[PDB]
Amino acid sequence: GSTGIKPFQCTWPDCDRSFSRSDHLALHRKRHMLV
Ligand SMILES: [Zn+2]
């Protein structure tokens, strides 16, 4: 279903990801800035 309305939303425009896991979106975001 529509599970894009998440509080842990990735703020990458071309990506447009949204998470429920803080430990997942953290690494997802770390790899975004290539760190
Ligand atoms: Zn992302």
How much distance in Å is there from the Cα of 25 to the middle of ligand 1?
8
Q: How was this structure determined?
A: NMR
Residues forming beta bridges with residue 8, ordered by sequence position: 19
| DSSP code at position 23 | H
- Is-contact 18 4, C-beta < 8 A? yes
Helix residue spans in 1-35 (DSSP H): 22-30
Q: What CA–CA distances, in Å, run from 8 to 24, 25, 26?
A: 9, 7, 9
Q: How far is the CA of 12 from the centre of ligand 1 (A)?
A: 5
Residue 26 has, within 13 A of its CA and on its CB side, a CA count of 3
Ligand 1 mean position, distance from CA 3 (Å): 15
Tokens matching residue 27? 């690494």
d(CA 29, CA 13): 12
